[PDB]
């Protein structure tokens, strides 16, 4: 099972604060330390701080502006990081990690993408992407779904509820008018479709919404 569970996203207006969590499971020891790591898109990993649940003490990075505050709940095995008075500069992915007090990060959480904007949350609209009636098919056929008009990042696109992973390309989101847009492509045997169904699963953590869109040949 997933040792460290982290919320998918957190939208925060400039000047406001947010409280990220990190549910921990599996073996736990009094010597465990929970670290937090910041990573802005396209950049490296930055050590933010750490805390030892058993005792409750936490330390922070002295080379940066303190924006976080770490706490822990021993009963629920959950670690929290309070980020305050945020600005776009604080927009990034915040990972939580577990160290058995031996210096290395044995396990990392999936990470919580935090966006700092005044814009409002908006679910994505999923549109199918089937070939044209004039398109010629080979031994393979390419399909997909168009996901546009969502905010903020990110979204996770899977095919056939995960069962279909091979030949899948999910392109980076493009920002235009306070809204992101991206598409996903999946290639499978020309023969297997549309006999064997193909559906795209699009989850948007920020809005707590997950829709499906079966791809069927045009009329």
């Amino acid at each position: 099972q997933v040792q460290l569970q982290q919320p998918g996203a957190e939208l925060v207006k400039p000047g406001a604060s947010v409280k990220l969590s990190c549910k921990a499971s599996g073996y736990t020891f009094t010597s465990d330390w929970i670290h937090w790591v910041k990573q802005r898109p396209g950049h490296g990993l930055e050590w933010i701080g750490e805390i030892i649940p058993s005792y409750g003490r936490a330390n922070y990075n002295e080379k940066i502006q303190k924006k976080a505050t770490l706490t822990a709940d021993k009963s629920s095995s959950t670690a929290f990081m309070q980020l305050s008075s945020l600005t776009s500069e604080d927009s990034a992915v915040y990972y939580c990690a577990r160290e058995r007090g031996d210096g290395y990060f044995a396990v990392w959480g999936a990470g919580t993408t935090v966006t700092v904007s005044s814009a409002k949350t908006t679910p994505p609209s999923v549109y199918p992407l089937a070939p044209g009636s004039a398109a010629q098919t080979n031994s393979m056929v390419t399909l997909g779904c168009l996901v546009k008009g969502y905010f903020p990042e990110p979204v996770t696109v899977t095919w056939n509820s995960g069962s279909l992973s091979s030949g899948v390309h999910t392109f980076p989101a493009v920002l235009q008018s306070d809204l992101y847009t991206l598409s996903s492509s999946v290639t499978v045997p020309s023969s297997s479709w549309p006999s064997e169904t193909v559906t795209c699963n699009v989850a948007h953590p920020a809005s707590s919404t997950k829709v499906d869109k079966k791809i069927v040949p045009r009329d």
Binding site: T30, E50, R57, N59, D102, G103
Partner: peptide, 20 residues
């Protein structure tokens, strides 16, 4: 051993920071 680590982490340049 336990307390040395708890007490030394947070001090820039300290080495007594891992249990073994």
């Amino acid at each position: 051993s336990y307390l040395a680590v708890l007490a030394e982490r947070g001090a820039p340049g300290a080495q007594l920071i891992t249990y073994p």
